Amino acid sequence: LNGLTDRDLCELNECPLDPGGYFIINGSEKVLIAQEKMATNTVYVFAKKDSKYAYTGEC
Amino acid sequence: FMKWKEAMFSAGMQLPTLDEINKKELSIKEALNYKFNDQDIEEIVKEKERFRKAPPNYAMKKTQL
């Protein structure tokens, strides 16, 4: 359905309002949740006090 | 029936036998209840679509794709 007309979408038993962008595995609509983490290649500096180090630069 | 009998007698073709008709009529009966377990559905649909035009009707998008 890459850039298909609403006509063909309806003919194919689909609607043009479906945002799409979800997989169909074993007949179920699967959606991937965007996971977040710390940005790589950046040097952070923390001051964990519950340890032996006063300051810590992480990369 | 009489016309067909006269035509057969004039043409010379020996009339079928009663037992022949009795054993032949069962052919249609046993063929009607024939299970479609072999691979004949493919040939049937092919021979149908050979003459049945494509656009009709709910497969327009599929045909375009």
Swiss-Prot record, chain B:
It is found in: Nucleus, Nucleoplasm. Component of the PAF1 complex, which consists of CDC73, PAF1, LEO1, CTR9, RTF1 and SKIC8; the association of RTF1 appears to be less stable than that of other subunits. At least in HeLa cells a N-terminal shorter form of RTF1 is also found in the complex. The PAF1 complex interacts with PHF5A. The Plus3 domain mediates single-stranded DNA-binding. Component of the PAF1 complex (PAF1C) which has multiple functions during transcription by RNA polymerase II and is implicated in regulation of development and maintenance of embryonic stem cell pluripotency. PAF1C associates with RNA polymerase II through interaction with POLR2A CTD non-phosphorylated and 'Ser-2'- and 'Ser-5'-phosphorylated forms and is involved in transcriptional elongation, acting both independently and synergistically with TCEA1 and in cooperation with the DSIF complex and HTATSF1. PAF1C is required for transcription of Hox and Wnt target genes. This is RNA polymerase-associated protein RTF1 homolog. The gene is RTF1. The chain holds residues 452 to 516 of 710 of the full protein.
